[PDB]
Amino acid sequence: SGFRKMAFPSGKVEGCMVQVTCGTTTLNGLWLDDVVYCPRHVICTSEDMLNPNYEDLLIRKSNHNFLVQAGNVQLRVIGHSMQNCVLKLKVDTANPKTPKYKFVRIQPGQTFSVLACYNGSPSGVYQCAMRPNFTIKGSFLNGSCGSVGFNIDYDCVSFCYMHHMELPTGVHAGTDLEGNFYGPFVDRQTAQAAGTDTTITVNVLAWLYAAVINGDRWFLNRFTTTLNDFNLVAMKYNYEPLTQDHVDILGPLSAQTGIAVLDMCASLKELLQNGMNGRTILGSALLEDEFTPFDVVRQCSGVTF
Amino acid sequence: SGFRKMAFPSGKVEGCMVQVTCGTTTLNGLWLDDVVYCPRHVICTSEDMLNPNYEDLLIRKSNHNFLVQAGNVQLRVIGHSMQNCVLKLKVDTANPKTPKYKFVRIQPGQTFSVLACYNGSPSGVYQCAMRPNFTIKGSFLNGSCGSVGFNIDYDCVSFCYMHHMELPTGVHAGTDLEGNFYGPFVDRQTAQAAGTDTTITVNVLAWLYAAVINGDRWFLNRFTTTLNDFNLVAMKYNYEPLTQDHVDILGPLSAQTGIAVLDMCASLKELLQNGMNGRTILGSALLEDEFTPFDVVRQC
Numbered sequence: 245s246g247f248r249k250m251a252f253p254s255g256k257v258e259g260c261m262v263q264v265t266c267g268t269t270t271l272n273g274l275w276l277d278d279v280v281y282c283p284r285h286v287i288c289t290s291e292d293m294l295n296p297n298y299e300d301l302l303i304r305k306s307n308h309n310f311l312v313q314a315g316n317v318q319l320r321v322i323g324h325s326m327q328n329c330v331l332k333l334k335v336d337t338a339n340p341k342t343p344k345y346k347f348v349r350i351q352p353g354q355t356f357s358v359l360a361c362y363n364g365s366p367s368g369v370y371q372c373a374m375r376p377n378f379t380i381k382g383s384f385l386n387g388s389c390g391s392v393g394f395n396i397d398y399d400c401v402s403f404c405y406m407h408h409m410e411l412p413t414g415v416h417a418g419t420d421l422e423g424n425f426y427g428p429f430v431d432r433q434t435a436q437a438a439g440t441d442t443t444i445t446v447n448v449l450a451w452l453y454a455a456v457i458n459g460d461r462w463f464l465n466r467f468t469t470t471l472n473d474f475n476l477v478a479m480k481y482n483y484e485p486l487t488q489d490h491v492d493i494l495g496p497l498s499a500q501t502g503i504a505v506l507d508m509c510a511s512l513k514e515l516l517q518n519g520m521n522g523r524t525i526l527g528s529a530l531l532e533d534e535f536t537p538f539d540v541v542r543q544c545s546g547v548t549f
Numbered sequence: 550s551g552f553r554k555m556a557f558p559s560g561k562v563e564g565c566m567v568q569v570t571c572g573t574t575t576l577n578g579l580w581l582d583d584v585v586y587c588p589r590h591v592i593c594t595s596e597d598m599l600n601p602n603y604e605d606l607l608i609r610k611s612n613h614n615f616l617v618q619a620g621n622v623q624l625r626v627i628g629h630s631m632q633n634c635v636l637k638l639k640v641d642t643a644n645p646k647t648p649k650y651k652f653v654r655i656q657p658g659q660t661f662s663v664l665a666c667y668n669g670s671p672s673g674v675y676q677c678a679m680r681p682n683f684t685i686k687g688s689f690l691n692g693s694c695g696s697v698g699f700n701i702d703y704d705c706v707s708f709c710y711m712h713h714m715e716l717p718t719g720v721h722a723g724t725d726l727e728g729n730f731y732g733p734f735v736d737r738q739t740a741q742a743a744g745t746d747t748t749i750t751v752n753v754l755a756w757l758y759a760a761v762i763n764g765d766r767w768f769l770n771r772f773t774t775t776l777n778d779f780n781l782v783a784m785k786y787n788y789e790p791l792t793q794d795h796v797d798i799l800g801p802l803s804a805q806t807g808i809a810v811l812d813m814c815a816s817l818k819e820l821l822q823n824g825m826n827g828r829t830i831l832g833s834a835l836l837e838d839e840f841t842p843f844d845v846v847r848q849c
């Protein structure tokens with residue numbers, strides 16, 4: 245029993261973290277076989293970030309300008325290229341600790357584990373959801389750029405996030421491993437603000453099922469509703485609309501508890517309309533939306549890797 | 550910026566996790582040098598747990614009765630002994646992935662990371678606090694026994710917890726790595742109640758400092774309180790007493806925010822009496838008490 249925000253074991257990714265230095269700028273890189281991936285703005289000075297001409301800045305750089313360090317070992321860069329906002333440094337040495345991996349682009353509402361690193365050394369691991377506004381609410385300090393987010397899909401590390409920046413909001417923005425930003429953000433010092441966010445409704449429902457599995461039932465009522473009626477309420481409280489694909493994804497949790505999804509929707513509607521009655525659910529006094537349906541199944545079923 | 554419940558990277562512990570089987574009972578063990586540590590009740594049947602005599606149950610066992618698997622490599626057991634509620638299986642090969650480590654016994658209110666494992670393989674990592682009543686509010690399923698809790702310093706892993714059981718209330722109890730249970734619990738299927746739990750006051754204050762650092766200030770007031778006057782209020786809400794040792798521990802955060810500890814105590818006093826006014830702090834509508842002062846420093 246019990247339910248916590250749980251990250252994937254980080255060992256496989258820890259073995260891939262290196263430090264990348266260009267001039268005065270240091271950050272983290274991901275070392276996979278004989279390529280190191282890192283944010284391309286490592287090549288930029290503070291003055292370059294005002295209006296960086298990345299294609300030109302990279303042309304002026306050579307391999308010797310890139311100091312890659314895997315712990316105490318210096319990796320020799322023998323090639324450098326740019327894929328969108330990610331720099332790819334080919335090195336003399338292939339990482340013997342490279343896990344079976346894939347690069348995937350996640351959708352808003354999906355979660356991943358973040359391995360926060362500094363100077364190529366991992367510092368901590370925690371779970372993040374990709375917010376609907378394409379930011380994440382992370383915990384990052386100076387030098388955390390190049391930290392990566394990932395999932396472990398059965399027998400494969402799926403990298404989905406590389407950290408690039410902190411917005412004035414204090415929330416965080418980055419790219420997939422192909423170097424394409426999540427959301428409308430750019431690696432330049434220009435005006436950037438996260439759009440209006442929303443609550444991930446299917447995740448809230450998944451979390452209520454988790455509570456039921458763990459014995460919490462006070463919020464269950466004898467009512468049911470329609471998908472349309474539920475979505476009229478959800479809109480009023482800045483919740484994302486619930487689709488039939490969302491209902492389908494909740495099927496395993498509805499099966500496990502015997503509570504139909506639209507019954508749970510009726511319970512959530514009442515919680516939205518009248519509050520949580522000064523009670524807590526799985527240690528929270530608010531409705532939590534950073535657990536996916538699969539996160540719930542994984543935790544309550546003991547999936548291993 | 551930002552503030553999150555963060556676990557230590559689990560790699561160094563992952564490389565120590567193995568599977569221990571005795572008869573039909575399997576669980577996790579911790580392989581350090583040439584010794585595998587695991588809960589001693591791995592030697593019990595479901596029925597033995599009603600009234601076990603571990604000393605006698607262990608005489609019935611041979612080295613061959615213990616199947617230890619590092620993944621799918623069998624580790625030859627060449628010795629077995631019991632230390633309090635932990636079994637120590639001597640194996641014929643030292644773990645090449647043994648980190649620098651120590652066994653430590655932690656106090657209520659201290660935090661640690663848990664690497665939840667099943668059949669010797671890691672499933673997830675999260676952060677826990679040892680509660681004042683010596684339970685932990687974990688996430689553990691059947692087969693999770695032998696999962697360990699730890700802190701990482703330098704690159705030294707300080708192991709502080711090994712999981713043994715879930716109480717009927719859904720909370721969790723275990724031992725240090727010398728086999729001594731935290732709290733008044735025993736590895737026998739008998740009535741054992743956890744004491745009434747209380748809130749870890751020093752951690753709540755540390756977290757309020759974290760919120761100030763991240764911009765939340767609505768709860769700050771200019772009220773003033775004595776340490777004793779504060780403790781009189783906190784005791785009414787089942788908060789742990791705050792001592793001068795706690796005040797000193799919060800010094801580094803009070804220095805950074807320029808907010809005196811007792812002034813932060815005056816904010817906490819008002820939050821306990823009135824409530825939070827339908828507002829939130831660092832994304833929570835409850836007072837969070839599972840961040841130590843050092844967790845707040847390390848993270849910021």
Ligand SMILES: *CC(=O)[C@H](CCCNC(=N)N)NC(=O)[C@H](Cc1ccccc1)NC(=O)[C@@H](Cc1ccccc1)NC(=O)CCOCC#C
Nearest residue numbers: 269270271386387388389408409410411412431432433434
């Ligand atoms: C993330 C990271 O570590 C590197 C710095 C690496 C070298 N320095 C150290 N190791 N100590 N990246 C940044 O610092 C990052 C670069 C950047 C700049 C502009 C756009 C994308 C990326 N800078 C930030 O994350 C700025 C982002 C920003 C963007 C537009 C306008 C202003 C600022 N965020 C902050 O510095 C934190 C405060 O955010 C609001 C402000 C200012």
Ligand SMILES: *CC(=O)[C@H](CCCNC(=N)N)NC(=O)[C@H](Cc1ccccc1)NC(=O)[C@@H](Cc1ccccc1)NC(=O)CCOCC#C
Nearest residue numbers: 574575598691692693694713714715716717736737738739
């Ligand atoms: C922790 C662990 O994995 C093993 C499981 C045994 C082998 N592996 C698998 N089946 N995969 N240990 C237990 O499950 C554990 C053994 C035990 C029994 C008595 C005292 C200490 C340890 N049993 C539990 O954790 C019971 C503990 C208990 C103790 C006294 C009275 C009742 C129950 N807790 C639960 O099973 C949780 C369910 O709620 C109990 C209730 C109501």
